[PDB]
Design a protein around this ligand. Structure first.
Ligand SMILES: CCCCCCCC/C=C/CCCCCCCC(=O)O[C@@H](COC(=O)CCCCCCCCCCCCCCC)COP(=O)([O-])OCC[N+](C)(C)C
Ligand SMILES: CCCCCCCC/C=C/CCCCCCCC(=O)O[C@@H](COC(=O)CCCCCCCCCCCCCCC)COP(=O)([O-])OCC[N+](C)(C)C
Ligand SMILES: CCCCCCCC/C=C\CCCCCCCC(=O)O[C@@H](COC(=O)CCCCCCCCCCCCCCC)COP(=O)([O-])OCC[N+](C)(C)C
Ligand SMILES: CCCCCCCC/C=C\CCCCCCCC(=O)O[C@@H](COC(=O)CCCCCCCCCCCCCCC)COP(=O)([O-])OCC[N+](C)(C)C
Ligand SMILES: CCCCCCCC/C=C\CCCCCCCC(=O)O[C@@H](COC(=O)CCCCCCCCCCCCCCC)COP(=O)([O-])OCC[N+](C)(C)C
Ligand SMILES: CCCCCCCC/C=C\CCCCCCCC(=O)O[C@@H](COC(=O)CCCCCCCCCCCCCCC)COP(=O)([O-])OCC[N+](C)(C)C
Ligand SMILES: CCCCCCCC/C=C\CCCCCCCC(=O)O[C@@H](COC(=O)CCCCCCCCCCCCCCC)COP(=O)([O-])OCC[N+](C)(C)C
Ligand SMILES: CCCCCCCC/C=C\CCCCCCCC(=O)O[C@@H](COC(=O)CCCCCCCCCCCCCCC)COP(=O)([O-])OCC[N+](C)(C)C
Ligand SMILES: CCCCCCCC/C=C\CCCCCCCC(=O)O[C@@H](COC(=O)CCCCCCCCCCCCCCC)COP(=O)([O-])OCC[N+](C)(C)C
Ligand SMILES: CCCCCCCC/C=C\CCCCCCCC(=O)O[C@@H](COC(=O)CCCCCCCCCCCCCCC)COP(=O)([O-])OCC[N+](C)(C)C
Ligand SMILES: CCCCCCCC/C=C\CCCCCCCC(=O)O[C@@H](COC(=O)CCCCCCCCCCCCCCC)COP(=O)([O-])OCC[N+](C)(C)C
Lengths: 511, 114, 70, 114
């Protein structure tokens, strides 16, 4: 029927720009590209697509009201293998090959995004994996490829990966979009692709390792000298350099965190503080040191509290740098998940029980007689709460001869608190964080690498306009006579193909 | 006993060392933070506070971690509220978080080396 | 794994108990609409549920309304 | 038989009856689910709620939730009409009622303690 309508003069380039066709909640509509060709591509109808491409008025490069094209629409409707099949990747390949031009993948929609960048932003790992490692065997259109096999000698092949919009050197790049964005769940598996992983590795082994070590050393020395000048207070011409360096480095951290918070999005502030908590605590420590010296300059007695809090927070903030090593990185992210998942629930329930039993026990004791003040340790509400807290941590001695008019009820409430906290709550907490470290046992080699990639990209952004001339690898990428752009040599070993190498580029293997 | 010995080996190098490293960082940081909140003792008095020096504060936190001694909050601190806040923070971070997570972690260790 | 259900069982019990707590009035908060099927009388109630699946790929014949959406 | 399937714990038969769609037009009033429209991979279906919604004394939802002599009670509430009905009820009136009960009991306990 579609062929009969098309052969009779149907509007191929008609745009279904209705409101139902462009949904906002993804529950009351179905977005396909607002084009019959895009609808045929998105609904797994290959025969209709091929019938539509070869026609006298079909516009493959048509852009709908969202600025999207057929490749953008195929990227948006793409999904994992569980929900749908791989037909979108096959349709993407077929339409791109039939078009035979680079204008489809270099067209930006009404968001400043290419279909490659849109696939990186939307979380489509399968489509991004296809595009990043796209190799075309035929020589009629080989400039459309992004991966080129330079040579392949036996089970050893060297492939060149294009890095046009992938390396963080073209404003909005695939690497920066994959790492910095937060509104996706498959962020970990997208960084395991061939060019992105290798690029992160080489960046870390080139400049990010020394930058992270320098930051660790400077913060460690700053914390050490802050501790030394605060603990050895009078309660020094050669010792003035330490406190001046404390002030200078605190101001530097304060302004750095201020400019890193000012442009901070409210989207990464979601989840549970897994990517911005250290920014806040570093800023708080910096302004605590600033306020400490601010009150120390004048006659303010409440200046040592901020300084001591700065020492404690600064020595607590030094655990951020444990992400440089692998095992300590796993330990740090597991501290994060544990302290937010089940430490908070245990604290909430324990505080409810502690305050309830503390105010119940403090009401069972009458006033002390004349010339007596140490009749009972559970005197006030704060005293009873402190006694229950001391009992929970195993400190002190259990005394049951208090000034309670109902000692049996007092002992019953005390034993009930003992069971509920020491037997039930604490031991169940130990049992629960075993399940937590069981689940995050496998989900720790990725999140730590996500933090490492964030630090690498932040350190690279810290570099000035110069000194950034440390690009990936070489200039020659493909057979194109002009604008070779960049490349990235990756060697792969596999003993299962055993095929004749025809897509090879260079006759001489190796350097 | 051979299995017990090699599991001692893996445990004491895998997660006992990490726990010791993090605990020592917290212990020394909180010990030097608490020792700075207490002024000098008055005349004819030397037992005003158990957190007198840095070594004394570190020893008191170590005694608190192992469950020995008695918790005394009436020290010679000019800011007793901040002193109690830091003490409770150390209690949570070590007794609630670090030690119990260590017990949870070496369960995974003895599961893999089982 | 046996915690996402039992909690929902308790939640359903609380929902039904709270609905029973409502008087004879104020309970006029029925599910959805009145038109359900092609029957000319006693349309009773209905409940609109939207489902998404990319595996069937079949021509829709059991459809009821030609115009999708509201 | 629908209520008997809900009471006896037969989740498969209840799943068939609740989502029973008949393609042929000779007897379509026997269906309980009707597809209003289906545009691409998006379809809107209408589910009958004659004896399912808690408005006809002994209903399928009340029987499924309130009864206790079954073991597959959890999987019976995951069906298409019952889940959605519980969701909308919670998001309509049960959320505010539960919050009001929590606030009133919290204030009552606070003032009793005081
Ligand atoms: C399993 C158990 C482990 C612990 C579980 C938790 C247990 C928590 C329970 C704690 C209660 C312990 C006893 C409280 C003190 C009672 C006596 C007292 O001094 O009262 C004081 C109140 O005291 C306070 O308000 C203390 C400071 C806050 C306590 C909570 C800290 C939580 C830190 C969490 C950090 C984040 C989490 C950390 C990790 C991220 C009154 O003041 P004063 O000193 O009497 O004198 C007044 C001063 N004046 C004279 C100048 C006017
Ligand atoms: C979860 C918790 C569990 C523990 C966790 C770890 C906690 C660690 C924390 C420990 C701190 C405890 C308090 C320290 C002492 C303070 C007071 C003091 O005496 O100061 C003294 C310093 O003291 C030292 O230097 C002590 C010796 C080394 C301590 C670390 C041993 C680690 C062993 C690890 C073995 C390998 C691992 C084992 C497995 C393979 C000063 O000397 P003095 O005595 O005051 O007098 C001076 C002498 N004079 C007069 C002659 C000049
Ligand atoms: C509340 C939970 C805090 C811990 C937490 O969020 O985890 C942290 C890890 O955790 C660590 O590695 C330890 C953090 C230091 C100790 C935390 C308790 C505060 C002590 C206070 C002592 C008294 C001072 C009180 C001052 C008011 C956060 O780690 P993350 O989320 O993986 O980091 C990602 C953020 N980034 C990408 C920007 C780098
Ligand atoms: C969106 C973000 C954009 C930021 C742009 C800022 C302006 C850029 C322009 C200018 C800033 C230039 C550097 C400022 C240094 C002071 C700042 C400081 O406190 O130390 C910095 C360290 O940074 C270094 O280690 C300095 C390296 C300088 C360049 C030399 C590299 C040589 C490599 C030779 C190789 C052969 C900050 O360290 P951090 O690890 O970030 O701190 C961790 C805390 N946090 C996780 C909460 C952050
Ligand atoms: C030691 C405790 C002192 C007290 C701290 C107290 C506070 C506790 C807080 C933190 C302590 C625990 C975490 C420390 C993290 C900082 C170091 C770091 O990031 O190293 C890293 C970079 O550093 C280098 O290896 C430097 C290389 C030379 C730099 C030259 C600059 C000029 C090492 O990285 P890596 O993953 O080993 O390198 C990968 C390559 N490999 C796998 C093949 C090896
Ligand atoms: C100052 C500290 C307050 C800091 C508040 C931060 C809230 C973090 C919440 C959090 O980690 O959620 C946890 C639950 O957590 C709860 O259920 C929390 C219940 C209230 C206790 C809050 C601390 C009480 C401390 C004493 C007063 C995680 O729960 P989940 O089942 O993993 O939730 C899945 C979704 N999520 C992982 C995206 C969260
Ligand atoms: C984190 C937020 C959570 C908790 C923080 C603490 C909340 C309560 C604060 C009270 C502090 C106070 O000043 O109390 C005073 C009295 O006050 C009472 O006796 C109050 C009794 C009711 C509230 C506490 C018990 C129930 C809490 C249920 C759980 C709540 C939620 C828990 C959420 C996890 C102290 O009285 P006192 O020590 O006798 O003072 C001596 C002087 N006097 C004898 C002249 C009076
Ligand atoms: C509830 C009903 C009232 C309980 C209180 C009884 C009265 C009471 O104070 O008795 C006791 C607490 O009371 C107990 O023995 C309570 C034991 C736990 C109650 C909950 C069990 C579950 C304590 O009473 P007494 O003053 O130590 O001696 C009782 C005097 N008489 C035996 C002569 C009566
Ligand atoms: C005197 C004692 C010092 C003895 C040093 C020996 C180092 C052993 C390291 C070790 O067992 O690695 C562990 C990590 O371990 C860490 O991450 C260690 C971090 C520093 C803490 C070192 C002890 C601190 C004691 C207080 C100061 C094992 O980590 P992993 O993830 O299993 O690493 C895989 C590779 N591997 C098994 C081959 C190691
Ligand atoms: C294993 C290696 C790790 C750790 C071993 C121990 C490292 C520090 C050693 C100091 C010992 C010393 O003599 O201190 C002295 C002071 O010194 C201080 O007060 C130093 C304060 C800064 C360092 C400790 C806190 C931060 C450590 C962060 C973590 C570091 C890395 C952790 C890696 C796991 C003792 O002072 P005092 O007791 O008051 O002496 C009485 C006499 N007086 C009053 C006249 C002064
Ligand atoms: C940070 C901003 C400054 C904090 C210190 C405030 C000043 C201070 O020493 O107050 C308290 C600590 O201070 C607290 O009460 C700290 C409570 C925990 C802070 C972090 C919470 C997370 C202790 O102060 P104080 O001398 O016991 O009495 C205060 C006097 N005033 C109430 C008349 C002012």
């Amino acid at each position: 029927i579609a062929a009969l309508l098309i052969a009779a003069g149907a509007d191929v380039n008609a745009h279904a720009k209705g409101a139902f066709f462009n949904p906002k909640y993804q529950h009351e509509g179905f977005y396909f590209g607002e084009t019959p060709l895009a609808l045929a591509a998105c609904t797994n109808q290959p025969e209709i697509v091929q019938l539509l491409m070869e026609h006298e008025q079909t516009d493959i490069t048509s852009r709908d009201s969202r600025g999207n094209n057929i490749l953008h629409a195929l990227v948006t409707v793409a999904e994992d293998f569980k929900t749908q099949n791989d037909f979108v990747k096959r349709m993407y390949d077929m339409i791109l090959l039939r078009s035979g031009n680079w204008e489809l993948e270099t067209t930006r929609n009404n968001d400043g995004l290419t279909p490659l960048q849109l696939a990186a932003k939307m979380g489509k790992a399968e489509i991004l994996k296809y595009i990043l490692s796209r190799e075309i065997k035929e020589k009629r259109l080989r400039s459309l490829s992004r991966k080129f096999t330079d040579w392949a000698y036996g089970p050893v092949s060297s492939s060149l990966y294009d890095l046009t919009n992938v390396d963080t050197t073209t404003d909005n790049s695939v690497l920066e979009i994959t790492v910095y964005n937060t509104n996706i769940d498959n962020r970990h598996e997208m960084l395991t692709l061939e060019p992105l992983h290798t690029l992160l590795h080489m960046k870390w082994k080139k400049f990010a390792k020394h930058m992270f070590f320098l930051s660790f050393c400077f913060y460690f020395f700053y914390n050490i000298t802050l501790t030394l000048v605060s603990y050895y207070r009078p309660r020094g011409w050669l010792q003035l350099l330490g406190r001046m360096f404390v002030l200078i480095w605190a101001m530097c951290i304060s302004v750095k965190e201020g400019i890193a918070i000012f442009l901070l999005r409210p989207s990464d502030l979601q989840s549970i503080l897994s990517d911005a908590w250290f920014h806040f605590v570093f800023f708080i420590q910096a302004v605590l040191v600033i306020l400490s010296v601010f009150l120390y300059l004048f006659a303010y007695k409440e200046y040592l509290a901020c300084l001591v809090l700065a020492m404690a927070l600064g020595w607590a903030n030094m655990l951020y740098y444990t992400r440089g090593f692998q095992s300590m990185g796993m330990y740090s992210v597991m501290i994060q998940k544990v302290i937010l998942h089940d430490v908070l629930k245990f604290l909430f329930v324990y505080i409810v029980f502690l305050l309830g039993f503390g105010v119940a026990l403090a009401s069972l004791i009458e006033k002390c007689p004349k010339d007596n003040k140490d009749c009972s340790s559970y005197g006030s509400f704060s005293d009873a709460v402190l006694e229950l807290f001391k009992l929970t941590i195993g400190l002190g001695d259990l005394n049951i001869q208090q000034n309670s008019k109902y000692p049996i009820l007092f002992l019953f409430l005390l034993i009930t608190y003992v069971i509920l906290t020491f037997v039930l709550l604490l031991n169940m907490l130990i049992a629960l964080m075993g399940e937590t470290v069981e689940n995050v046992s496998k989900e720790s080699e990725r999140i730590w690498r996500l933090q490492r990639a964030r630090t690498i990209l932040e350190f690279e952004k810290m570099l000035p306009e110069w000194l950034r001339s440390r690009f990936r690898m070489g200039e020659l990428c493909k057979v194109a006579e002009d604008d070779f752009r960049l490349c990235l040599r990756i060697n792969e070993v596999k003993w299962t193909e055993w095929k004749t190498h025809v897509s090879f580029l260079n006759e001489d293997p190796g350097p």
